[PDB]
Amino acid sequence: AMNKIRKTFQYGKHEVTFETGEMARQATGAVVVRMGDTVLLVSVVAKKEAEEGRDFFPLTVNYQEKTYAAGKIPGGYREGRPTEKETLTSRLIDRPLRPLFPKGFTNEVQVIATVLSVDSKVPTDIPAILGASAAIGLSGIPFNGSLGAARVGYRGGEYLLNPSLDELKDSALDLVVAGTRDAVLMVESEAQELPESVMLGAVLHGHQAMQVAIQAIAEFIQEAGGAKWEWEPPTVNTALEKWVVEKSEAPLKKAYQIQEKTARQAQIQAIRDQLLADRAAEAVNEHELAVIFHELERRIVREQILTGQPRIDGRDTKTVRPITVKVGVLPRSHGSALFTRGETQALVVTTLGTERDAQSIDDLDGDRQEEFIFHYNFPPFCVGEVGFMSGPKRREIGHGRLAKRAVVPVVPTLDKFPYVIRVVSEILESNGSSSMASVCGSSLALMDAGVPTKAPVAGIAMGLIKENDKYAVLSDILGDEDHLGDMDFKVAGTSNGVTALQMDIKIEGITKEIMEQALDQAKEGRLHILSIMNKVLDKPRSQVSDLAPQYVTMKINPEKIRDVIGKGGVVIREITEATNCAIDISDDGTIKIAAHTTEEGEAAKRRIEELTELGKVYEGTVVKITDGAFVQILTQGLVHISQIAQERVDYLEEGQVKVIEIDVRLSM
Amino acid sequence: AMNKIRKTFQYGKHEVTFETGEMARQATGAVVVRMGDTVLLVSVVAKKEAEEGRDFFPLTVNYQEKTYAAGKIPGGYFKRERPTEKETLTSRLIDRPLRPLFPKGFTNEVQVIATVLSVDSKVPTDIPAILGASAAIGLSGIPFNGSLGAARVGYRGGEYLLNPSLDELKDSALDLVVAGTRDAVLMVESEAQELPESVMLGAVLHGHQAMQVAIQAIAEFIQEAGGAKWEWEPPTVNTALEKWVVEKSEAPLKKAYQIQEKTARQAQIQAIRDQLLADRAAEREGEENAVNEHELAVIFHELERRIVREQILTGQPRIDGRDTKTVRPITVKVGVLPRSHGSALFTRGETQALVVTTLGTERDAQSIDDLDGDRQEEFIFHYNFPPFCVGEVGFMSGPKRREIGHGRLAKRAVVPVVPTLDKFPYVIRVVSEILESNGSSSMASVCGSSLALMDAGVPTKAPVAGIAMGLIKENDKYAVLSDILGDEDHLGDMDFKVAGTSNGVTALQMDIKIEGITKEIMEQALDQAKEGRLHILSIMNKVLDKPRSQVSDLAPQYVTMKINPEKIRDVIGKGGVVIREITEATNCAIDISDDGTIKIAAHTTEEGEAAKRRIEELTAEGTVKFGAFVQILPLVISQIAQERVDYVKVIQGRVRLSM
Amino acid sequence: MNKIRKTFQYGKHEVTFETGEMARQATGAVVVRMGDTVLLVSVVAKKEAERDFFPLTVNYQEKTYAAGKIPGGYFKREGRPTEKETLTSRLIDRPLRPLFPKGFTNEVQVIATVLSVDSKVPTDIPAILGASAAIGLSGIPFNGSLGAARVGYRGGEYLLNPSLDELKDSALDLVVAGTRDAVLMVESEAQELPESVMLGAVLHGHQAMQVAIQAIAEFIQEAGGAKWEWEPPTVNTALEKWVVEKSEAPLKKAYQIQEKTARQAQIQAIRDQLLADRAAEEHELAVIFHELERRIVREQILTGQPRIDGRDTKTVRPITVKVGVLPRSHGSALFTRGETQALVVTTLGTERDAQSIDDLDGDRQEEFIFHYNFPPFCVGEVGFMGPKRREIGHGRLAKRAVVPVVPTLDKFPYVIRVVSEILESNGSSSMASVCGSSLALMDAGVPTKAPVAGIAMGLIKENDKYAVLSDILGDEDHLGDMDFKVAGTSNGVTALQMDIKIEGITKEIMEQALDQAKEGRLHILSIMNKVLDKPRSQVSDLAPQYVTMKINPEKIRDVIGKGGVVIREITEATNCAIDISDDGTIKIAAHTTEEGEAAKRRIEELT
């Protein structure tokens, strides 16, 4: 039974289309989104059942790009493990969905967004979200949506809606916003030191722009929408609630007055364990029990701040935690630093390399190359846990990316600094926003390594607590205030402006007023941290490191250039492959060699002294014999029989000579 | 202590020896199979007890190829043998015929590992692998209905080939593996070039007759060297209870299965069950919990399979209302994706395939290194079976077993119609996305592939279609089901899939769960499947019946230039290092004819016109070492300055002019 | 802040411990530095226990930035534990485990990350010192702490904590860790060195070690927090008491019985007759039964009674041997000793087949490739099939035992790949892999210096009484207080491994142990040699061949080309390793005959 519904609307420069009822009919919901020539099939599947007493919402979004979308056969060996981009877009898509799924809805849902065709004029992430909104909306799955999304560029003082990839080459702002009709949900952006007034106006611009799509998706759901799932959250029995409150409230109140994190968490757990034990003394319950307990935590933490009382570690809403900053932390690194802000610590190591160390990426967008790679990883011992050490998690990529695009604007160009840079931020402790410590930390590690940055860059994490009209904007948030708070608001940049802005908003009905206030209280905190930073390292060091790849320089007769590059460019490639040294040659005459070592650096030249009289006493092998013998000196010259070892003269066959003349004679 | 028993016998051209009692002695059984110089160690291990409840049979086959078997050191750069397509596929090939041979209700976990110790090019490994499995299992004493042989059968010159090598299949119009017991064909797997059903069926029977010698060899080998057979029994019955559940539930159940609407139907069956459960409960009452509800479930489950089977056998319509011969609704579409080189959406009932074609350049060929390695594939056929197609949630990790197995079946269905590389100088990649599967998706993959390729302008020999079948057999009566649903394959005692063109079978796959499926039944089953695949062909032909007059503007193109033949040594270079570099540079296949042409394979134009330059410059303004001599491409004095004397116009010599 | 920094001197290098600055949230963490080698070591002990086994997991990881390098992968990151990383993790794990108190089920995870690496300081030792010190601060129940040292041999003199370059000139690379009191674990490779030299190295390592152990013991004081509250569970003498009085006599008679069936019958019977009368008057029973069971058998061997299979302590299981078992392999050997069996295959290749391993030891080529596969069927089990830890662990021991008798590449210009299949394992199969290798390399005509063998041993020590067990069964592993394995030639000892549970093990004995090992070694060797004595005078026909040709000296550069590009194309076209005499002939290393005469058709046109 095939009944195909299609809604079409016009989103700025492009025509968008949602189709349903043709493809993927067994999914709980599925939509074909086409925007320009960019097409995704977005299907959601949701289990009707949930595991009794589940602590988390098993939403999985899988965004996958098919190389047949761009007309290309996959390069390596089919499509392999997820590309960094795929991981990121899955994460970009997940974020805004999550808060729209009702509190307490634990059924596992899976969103799969597959790119069928990719148009260069239309980046995929935007219609992906539009699709996910539409698919979840069709499904009937409990959802508070529908959410739209928009990308906003900034060029010539105007705002660009849904810019292409090239168009962004001209933009100082790359920003994706996603929200509902009434509220902004999440924001991801990089920018070059733009002012808060611009960042905010950009979030608002997109939030207005996307309304057309949220309307369209909304009515699409009207026409073709399935039946709304009858569903309700797990129930709490207030008899038990009262019981839990009377027993744990006073203890939680103080337990939350413990400044030191691990001491706090231990005490909380003890309260939690006494509870469970106190209950048993008399599988859903324990969940129902945990629900009540968590609600209590929330109210306790929240009502403290809302009433003017001091925060968990005692700060007022406006004060950043204590910061200790060091550099030259590791002996063998090119650059390093240790950034400790409160209980959050990042050890950022910088490494340098030649083009050989540069990274090729493959994906839609075609095959490009990054000379700046930024890695971030988050080990279980920073949280005080025990876990598996396997490859980087979606957040570890997601946070690496954010930290990276915060820093990118101040990272020098290829022109000035002809290296490849690898930054690795390692979080050795995290009580909150380790993400921002990476930025801070890396800015120091980059300078400490001699990288000629435009200006020192730092970042801060904000949140708020709102009930009705009243709200407090928290600065330098800690894990608890993110978990029990209403938002996590990330701002990074230099003194002159914001390089990156990231928003995740749990609640709805947040206003530009609050947002406007949070961008500065952030701006303060940023400048506060910058000051404390600049006391250790204010500027990039005037030189790279000693163990850093350094160039070996030798000058060649511009005529002798015909050789070293070889016919077709083959001999220079042979050289760089054999020594692993990248060689750069002035059209005349100087050579500049990139050497990770002096051992190759010296191994790169010996190969170039080759391709490039006067005797000078060479040593070279005999090839032809006559009559004397032509030896091979690198060209050939005659050893006259008169000049063979004297006594008047065989004397050799072939295998192993001074040069005695030219217009080339030899002697022994 | 080691007691080593050997069995030597002739199989076709090759001497086969089984050994046991020397290696792998702690296995539940182990055999070293040798055929020609191909050698395998095949071992089986079975847990001695089933888990608490067990609803199924945990059979696992591991087939692995050591590269030392080929006297090679592995190419993988950490230099170790990620089970490959072939290793997976062959594992699945060995698995299939084993399953039906394990007795009903034997739930003990069983692992079969087949490792290739040495490889002979004359003797493909899978055949001895199946024989070895047959022997190890027999030796094990594990309960088994066996023992089974296998044979590969080729067709050349109108006559059958027994266990041919790859070299020999190059001249064969058929590649078919058949596995069976003394009395029965268990599984068939094959590709063929448009061969008629009787030649296909003839091959199955030729293999089945030909393998007997190996089955006999194994059977007596086992007799001699086997270990004590396991003492095992299928769960006891309660005949009285069964007769009672039947008398009670049968009439109502027959009426329930008259409801085509699932949720509505499953409701009734639950009612009938719950009622049955009450009735038993009263028949006892004061006796203590004498109602198990489990043994009842089993008896009940088995009764509804009987009943459904009976209804179809007596002419009743299938669960969805179709009779045995009718194929589900089909809808075909081409050119569904803007940026694809070709595409199709094939939907048959609830089975649906989005198939996409990508045209590519010699640069895109996927290399393969294995036993019989150093191979390039210009035809790349992938397959995808996402959780949502069956309407559930599942991980996305890598190609699954089924995805390889199904994907591969589809590929061998299509390959016979795919143009030779001389005729169509493109590498092809077809990716099959199964959006909806209840049905046979793999055959949908076939139909969609045939459409996708033509849509892309691939000059396929002819459109190819495929269809999946099932067969119910109760005693002497049987029914042949066309285009079976998913739930229908457990209904039947054998399932087969047949793909081909209007003129012949390009692939045939058979899995048989029972004994006494005759050449006659097969003959008739294949006919109904033919009538089916033509029905489907006719439908798809209405959308696109022949390849497109040309290639998508989005596909790779040839760029053509003319050169100086005397300069060919210059472009190819000394040793051929120059032309190499050019390709790895621009990523273009550069094929230089004797004189004087150059054909350049280019994905984009930019890549192509780049190949042009590096060529041209190397053959046909600027910027040295008074007088000028700047030299530019790898010497104007008056015209530096007429002002006399600081500080390519071109006309041993070689004097001018630059500036 | 603090930031407590202890500094001492280990031999040539200055070692530095510190804490309080970083990884504060961890149960404990230390930054250990030796020379310029730096490792963050951290220990997280999970809050509360759960179990009957010890969930200890050590992860030693290497960051490329420690070496100033960017990872060579496609993703430019490090996601794939290297064989090295897995090996070191295993190595750091061994000496720690036995130090963790009896009946401590609390889950512990130690993470040692290399943040900096010096060519003069191998990363092994500072890691172990740092793990020992990290666990120190955690306050986690521990009977430690310990330290580690490496010992080399150059010109009759031992070398403390030698570097990679220096090891080149050492006849010995030996790692040892131990508590102040006693030695715990040893891992070594030597070139046919005497037992006296090896064991002297274990002592030397143990003596030079105390400096570190002291430094550590102090570092804890200056910094480390007070211990964890803990104590061996619920010890019930009431439980012990009754069991014995109703248990020993019937059970000690149940092990005088033959191999199995009459064992698992009567024993299991006892587990009933005693199961029956218990309730007349918790799994806790299951143990103190097994522990008694242990004691029973431990005793019986000490009194010189049959081992579980009927063997005495000195006799090695019957050994059968075959070479050239597989038709198409370059070399083959099937080595069965008792119920342990290894099929081992030799494959030779051109320089094109050489291993490229990149890591903190610098970019390198390996022409000797050794692999070890331990499939589930050898033990009679079903299991899943990337090689596990123990496979690399056992594989690596086997390798280093064979390496010293392996020809240098100039003497035998072939890449070698040895693969060892364990088709049966009861009693050490890592040693079966060594015995299987000699034969296989020799069957393949690989001119090994001498046939090599190895044996796995065990020691039961109760008080001052003990017994040294030869060719230990898998089920004799729990019995032993020491599990050591030994491999070597008719002359010296190639490889030595030891792991030690109890204390008070004295030089006076393991000396003896190392002998009884030598006996068996010699014994095994004698039986091997009568199958294959010396390497085959020839390399197998199927193996790569060297085609030799002679061209005109003047044209040597028409082959090699310009900068070397022409000669690289030929080797990358035909897959042949090619070299030219200064002026003269040309040796072509070819896999097949075609491939090799493909190299000729090319070299001729250039001529």
| CA angle (C177 as vertex; C176, C180 as ends), nearest 5 | 125
- CA geometry: angle at C189 spanning C187 and C190, to 5°? 135
Amino acid present at A8: T
CA distance C262 to A425: 62
In angstroms, the CA A629 to CA A652 distance is 9
Among B116, B371, B73, B39, smallest CA distance to C418 is for: B73
Characterize the bridge pairing of strands A636-639 and A665-667: parallel
H/E stretch holding B217: helix B212-225
Kindly state whether C601 is in contact with chain B, defined as any CB-CB distance less than 8 angstroms: no
How far apart are the C-alpha atoms of B260 and C69, rounded to whole Å? 67
User: Which of chain B's residues have a Cβ under 8 Å away from the Cβ of A70?
Assistant: 339
CB under 8 Å, gap of 24 or more: what pairs does C299-307 form? C299/C252, C299/C462, C300/C252, C300/C255, C300/C256, C301/C460, C301/C467, C301/C469, C301/C479, C302/C460, C302/C462, C302/C465, C302/C466, C302/C467, C304/C467, C305/C256, C307/C469, C307/C473, C307/C476
Classify domain B548-620 at the CATH superfamily level: K Homology domain, type 1 (3.30.1370.10)
**Fold entry, domain C237-313:** Arc Repressor Mutant, subunit A (1.10.10)
Query: Minimal Cα–Cα distance from B119 to chain C, Å?
Result: 7
Bridge partner residues of B188 (DSSP): B178, B510
Nearest alpha carbon to residue A146 among A158, A138, A157, A154: A138
Q: Where does CATH 3.30.1370.10 sit in chain B?
A: 548-620
User: C326 and chain B: CB distance < 8 Å anywhere?
Assistant: yes
Q: How far apart are CA C223 and CA C2, in angstroms?
A: 9
CA distance B582 to chain A (A): 7
Closest CA to C263 of C299, C310, C311, C298: C310
Chain C's closest residue to A576, CA to CA, is C563
At B197, which amino acid appears? E
Q: Which residue of B has its CA nearest to A587?
A: B623
Instruction: Tell me the CA distances in angstroms from A335 to A329, A332, A428, A529, C362, one per residue in order.
Output: 8, 9, 18, 20, 20
CB contact under 8 Å between A47 and B392, yes or no, is: yes
Domain B1-236 annotated CATH 3.30.230.70: yes
| C-beta neighbour count of B569 within 10 angstroms | 10
Range A599-617 burial, b when 16+ CB lie within 10 A, else e? ebbebbbebbeebeeebee
Domain A318-540: give its CATH architecture: 2-Layer Sandwich (3.30)
Closest partner residue to C563 (CB to CB) among A360, A385, A571 is: A571
Q: Where are the beta strands (DSSP E) in B593-632?
A: 597-602
The 3-state secondary structure of C544-568 reads CEEEEEECCHHHHHHHHCCCCHHHH
DSSP B282-324: HHHTTSSS---SHHHHHHHHHHHHHHHHHHHHTTPPPTTS--T
Residue A159 main-chain phi, psi, to 5 deg: -115, 140
What are the φ/ψ torsions at residue B126 (nearest 5 degrees)?
Answer: -55, -45
Question: Per CATH, is C536-607 categorized as 3.30.70.260?
Answer: no
Q: How far apart are CA B98 and CA B115, in angstroms?
A: 17
Query: How far is A29 from A21, CA to CA, in rounded Å?
Result: 9
> Each residue of B110-129: b (16+ CB within 10 Å) or e?
bbbbbbbbbbbebbbbbbbb
Q: H helices within C413-454, ranges in order?
A: 429-443
**Cβ-proximal residues to B292 (8 Å cutoff; 6+ apart), any chain:** none
Q: Which helix (H) or strand (E) holds A297?
A: helix A284-306
Give A551's strand partners: A594
Cβ contacts of A598 within 8 Å, gap of 6 or more: none
Q: Give me the DSSP letters along A360-373.
A: EE-STT-SEEESEE
Whether A666 contacts A643, CB under 8 Å: yes
With beta carbons less than 8 A apart as the criterion, state whether C232 and C103 touch: yes
A588 touching B, CB under 8 A?
yes
For domain B325-547, is the CATH number 3.30.230.70?
yes
Question: Which residues in chain C are classed under CATH 3.30.230.70?
Answer: 2-225, 314-535
The β-bridge relationship of strands C415-424 and C368-373 is parallel
Q: Is C47 on the interface with B (CB under 8 A)?
A: no
Instruction: Give CA–CA dist C60/C58, Å, rounded.
Output: 6
Residue B154, beta-bridge partner list = B161
Handedness of CA C118, C119, C123, C124 (dihedral sign): negative
B430 touches A: beta carbon within 8 Å: no
Q: How far is CA B515 from CA A91, A581, B202, B528, C79, in A?
A: 53, 69, 19, 21, 52
C 528-557 residues inside an 8 A Cβ radius of A:
553-554, 556-557
First to last CA, chain B: 92
Cα distance between residue A341 and residue A322, in whole Å = 6
| Separation CA A493–CA B446 (nearest Å) | 55
Query: Which has the closest alpha carbon to A607: C357, C365, C568, C572?
Result: C568
Rounded Cα distance between C269 and C290, Å, is 14
Q: The tokens 């059984």 sit on which residue?
A: B29
CATH homologous superfamily of domain A541-616? K Homology domain, type 1 (3.30.1370.10)
**For testing contact with chain C, the best of A574, A575, A579, A600 (most C CBs within 10 A):** A574
**How far is Cα of residue C183 from the mean position of the Cα atoms in its chain?**
17
Cα-Cα-Cα-Cα torsion C68, C70, C72, C75, nearest 10 degrees, comes to: 150
In Å, what is the CA distance from C128 to each residue of C67, C159, C178, C221?
20, 19, 10, 19
C-to-N gaps above 2.5 Å in chain B, after residues: 81, 620, 623, 625, 634, 636, 645, 647, 651
**Do C105 and C52 form a contact (C-beta atoms < 8 A)?**
yes
C59 token code pair: 């992860």
CATH code reported for the domain at B237-324: 1.10.10.400
Any bridge partners for residue A65, and if so which? A115
Angle at Cα A270 formed by Cα A269 and Cα A272, nearest 5°? 60
CA angle A411, A415, A419 (to 5 degrees): 65
Q: Which residue, B125, B126, B146, is CA-closest to B135? A: B146
Please give the structure tokens belonging to residue C411. Answer: 């003497």
Query: What tokens does A287 get?
Result: 């969940």
Interchain contact B72–C (C-beta under 8 A): yes
The sign of the dihedral angle between the CA atoms of C286, C287, C290, C296 is: negative
CA distance C382 to chain B (A): 6
The token pair that represents A27 in the structure block: 């999914």
With a CB cutoff of 8 Å and minimum separation 6, the contacts of C591 are B72, C349, C350, C544, C575
Q: How many whole angstroms separate alpha carbon C178 and alpha carbon C499?
A: 10
Q: Are A561 and A589 in contact (CB under 8 A)?
A: yes
Cα gap B76→A516, rounded to integer Å: 56
The whole-angstrom separation of Cα B441 and Cα B395 is: 19
The SS3 of residue A11 is strand
Chain A: closest CA distance from residue B247 (Å): 36
Measured between alpha carbons, how far is B526 from B510 in angstroms, rounded to an integer? 11
Q: What distance in Å separates the CA atoms of residue C574 and residue A620, rounded to the nearest whole number? A: 30
CB-based contact A26 B574, cutoff 8 Å:
no
Query: Taking CB atoms and an 8 Å cutoff, what residues of chain C touch B2?
Result: 320, 336
Q: Classify domain A236-317 by CATH number.
A: 1.10.10.400
List phi, psi (to 5°) of A547.
Answer: -90, -5
Residue entry with tokens 């996910």: A132
**Are residues B436 and A26, on separate chains, in Cβ contact within 8 Å?**
yes
C296 at interface of B, judged by CB pairs closer than 8 A: no
Q: Is B110 on the interface with C (CB under 8 A)?
A: yes
Q: How far is CA C41 from the centre of its chain?
A: 22
CB C453 within 8 A of CB C521: yes
C168, with CB counted inside 10 A (0-12, 13-18, 19+), is exposed
Please tell me which residue of chain B has the smallest CA distance to C346. B68
Q: Name the percent of chain A in helix, strand, coil, to the closest 5.
A: 35, 30, 35
Put simply, the answer to whether A557 touches B625 (Cβ < 8 Å) is yes
Query: How far is it, in rounded angstroms, from Cα B164 to Cα B175?
Result: 9
Q: By three-state DSSP, how is residue A397 classified? A: helix
Asked if residue A471 lies in contact with residue A351, where contact means CB atoms within 8 angstroms, the answer is no
Chain A environment of B356 (Cβ under 8 Å) = 66, 68, 116
> Does any CB of chain C come closer than 8 Å to the CB of residue B47?
yes
Q: Which two tokens stand for residue B357?
A: 């074609």
Q: Which helix (H) or strand (E) holds A520?
A: helix A512-534
Question: Could you tell me if C135 and C142 are in contact, meaning their C-beta atoms sit under 8 angstroms apart?
Answer: yes
Query: What are the binding residues of A for Mg(2+)?
Result: 482, 488
User: Angle at Cα A551 formed by Cα A549 and Cα A553, nearest 5°?
Assistant: 165
Buried b (16+ CB within 10 A) or exposed e, C9-43: ebeebebbbbbbbbbbbbbbbbbbbbbbbbbbbbb
Check if the beta carbon of residue C347 is closer than 8 Å to that of residue C454.
Answer: no
May I ask the CATH class of domain C314-535? alpha beta
Structure tokens at B316: 């009743």
B519, B205 in Cβ contact below 8 A?
Answer: yes
Check residue A510 and report its DSSP letter: -
- Tell me if chain C has a CB within 8 Å of the CB of B568: no
Query: C103 to chain A, minimum CA–CA distance in Å?
Result: 20
**In 3-state terms, chain B is what percent helix, strand and coil (to 5)?**
35, 25, 40
Q: Which residue has the tokens 């009484």?
A: C465
The total of other beta-carbon atoms located within 10 Å of residue A394's CB is 14
d(CA C23, CA A347): 10
- Under 8 Å between Cβ of A464 and A485: yes
Class of domain A1-235 (CATH, top level): alpha beta
Instruction: List C-alpha distances in Å: B192 to B153, B172, B409, B469.
Output: 11, 9, 12, 19
- C1: helix, strand or coil: coil
CA A572 to chain centre: 35
Determine if the peptide bond prior to C145 is cis (ω within 30°): yes
Q: Give residue for tokens 């030869």.
A: C470
DSSP C350: -
Residues 6 or more apart whose CB falls under 8 angstroms from that of A238 comprise none
The length of chain C, given as a count of residues: 607
Secondary structure E strands in B420-474: 427-436, 465-474
Give how far A241 is from chain C: nearest CA, Å: 27
Give the separation between CA A636 and CA B180, rounded to whole angstroms: 75
Cβ of B581 and A569 within 8 Å?
A: yes
CA–chain centroid gap for C517, Å, is: 18
| Residues B92/B152, Cβ–Cβ less than 8 Å | no
Burial bucket for residue A380 (CB in 10 Å: 0-12, 13-18, 19+): middle
**What DSSP element (H or E) covers B406?**
helix B401-414
Q: Is C118 close to A429, i.e. CB distance below 8 A?
A: no
Cis peptide before B79 (omega within 30 of 0): no
> Could you tell me whether strands C13-19 and C28-34 are parallel, antiparallel, or unpaired per DSSP bridges?
antiparallel
Alpha-carbon distance of A618 to A666, in angstroms, equals 10
Q: Give SS3 for A473.
A: strand
Q: What is the 3-state secondary structure (H, E, C) of A239-273?
A: HHHHHHHHHHHHHHHHHCCCCCHHHHHHHHHHHHH
Residue whose entry in the numeric block shows the structure tokens 């491994």: C497
Give, for A394, the enclosing helix (H) or strand (E).
helix A394-407
Contact B140, B134 (CB under 8 A): no
Q: Which CATH number applies to C2-225?
A: 3.30.230.70
Technique that determined the structure: X-ray
* Chain B residues lying within 8 Å of C421, measured CB to CB: 115
Domain with CATH 3.30.230.70 in chain A: 1-235, 318-540
Structure's resolution in angstroms: 2.9
Q: From residue A38, how far is each of A49, A137, B606 by CA, in Å? A: 35, 21, 22
Q: What are the strands, taking DSSP E only, across C249-339? A: 319-323, 331-337
d(CA C223, CA C228): 15
Cα three-residue angle C427-C432-C437, rounded to 5 degrees: 170
Asked whether A291 and A236 are in contact (CB, 8 A), the reply is: yes
Structural contact between residues A339 and A388, judged by C-beta atoms closer than 8 angstroms = no
CA distance B66 to B80: 9
- Altogether, the residues listed in chain B come to a count of 659
**Number of CB atoms found within 10 A of residue B170's CB:** 8
| Cα dihedral B490, B496, B501, B504 in deg (nearest 10) | -160
In whole angstroms, what is the distance from residue B33 CA to residue B131 CA?
Answer: 8
Asked if residues C334 and C322 have their Cβ atoms less than 8 Å apart, the reply is yes
Q: How far is CA C91 from CA A381, A421, B178, C165, C171, in A?
A: 21, 34, 51, 21, 21
Do B540 and B446 contact (CB within 8 A), yes or no?
A: no
Q: How far apart are CA C340 and CA C53, in angstroms?
A: 26
Interhelix angle for B441-455 vs B401-414, to 10°? 50
Which of B345, B389, B429 is nearest residue A73 as measured by Cβ atoms? B429
